[PDB]
Amino acid sequence: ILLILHKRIIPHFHTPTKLMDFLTDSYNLQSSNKNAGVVPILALNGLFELMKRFNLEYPNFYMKLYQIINPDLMHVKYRARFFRLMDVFLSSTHLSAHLVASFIKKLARLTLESPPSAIVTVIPFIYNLIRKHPNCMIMLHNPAFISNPFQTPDQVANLKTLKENYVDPFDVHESDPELTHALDSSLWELASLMEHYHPNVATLAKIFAQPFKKLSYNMEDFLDWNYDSLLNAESSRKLKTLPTLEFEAFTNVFDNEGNVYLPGVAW
């Protein structure tokens, strides 16, 4: 019902405001059933349509939105729907730099344990937010920690002491995105993604190490990617040249119960 509410139900009602209580309860649903934890994500789309059509409000909207971001969001099939709405939410002009910094930091932290399809979504999303809000660029890089050849020996010592005393101030348990101290933190996770096993995903993460010449990235070209699509994408490519082989030789493919390719496994 919540999937089709925004399109196939609400437009056909005279007074769709009567669905406020149903949608608001769905958006605030908290249950011991794990499978019900995805209900608020779906209710958000229908809720916003009512918000948009009749100038209605949800109290503490961004704090609730910040809470909903969780590792489960990265894995649900409805990530594409959620991120489409989230861009509209974080495209507002009255959003604090700290507010957006917490969203960027939390998503990047989740990317450490996310599938490549989700990574393909988050990277251009973070690129747009930082480009929208240049104050968040300090997270990608802190100039105070850069070493200059001309800096005096006293400056070198002061730089060393600063490198001795730093602590990451980002709090993962704070529920208010304006108090997580993410802006003072750093996107030390996104650097890891540049070593992602897939070549294309790693190349996307390499953009943060490159100048931000591009004005924005179109999310619709990165949102609805799946494991099947990525596999189908590679299988299309033709073998122009034979694949490279391995010079090293292994006597036994698996371990026993000289050289073993896979220690710890046996026939």
Give the count of beta carbons closer than 10 Å to the beta carbon of residue 145.
Answer: 11
Nearer to another protein, 68 or 97 (CB): 97
Residue where the block lists tokens 């989700």: 118
Site map (CB under 8 A) of another protein, residues 61-80, x = contact: xx-------xxx--x-----
Instruction: Report how far residue 216's alpha carbon sits from residue 185's, in angstroms, rounded to the nearest whole number.
Output: 24
The helix or strand, by DSSP H or E, that contains position 254, with its residue range, turns out to be: strand 252-254
Q: Which residue has the tokens 């400056």?
A: 155
Give, for 262, the enclosing helix (H) or strand (E): strand 260-262
User: In the window 153-192, what residues touch another protein (CB under 8 A)?
Assistant: 163, 166, 168, 178, 183-184, 186-189, 191-192
221 near another protein, judged by CB under 8 A: yes
Q: Residues 97, 171, 174, 219: which binds another protein (CB under 8 A)? A: 97
Helix or strand (DSSP H, E) at 67 = helix 61-68
When binding is defined by CB under 8 A, the residue of 25, 141, 158, 175 that contacts another protein is: 141
Q: Decide if residue 208 touches another protein (CB under 8 A).
A: yes
The three-state secondary structure class of 43 is helix
Select from 10-18, 24-32, 39-47, 254-262 the region that touches another protein (CB under 8 A): 254-262
Residue 22 or 61 having the CB closest to another protein: 61
Q: Binders of another protein among 2-31, rule CB under 8 A? A: none
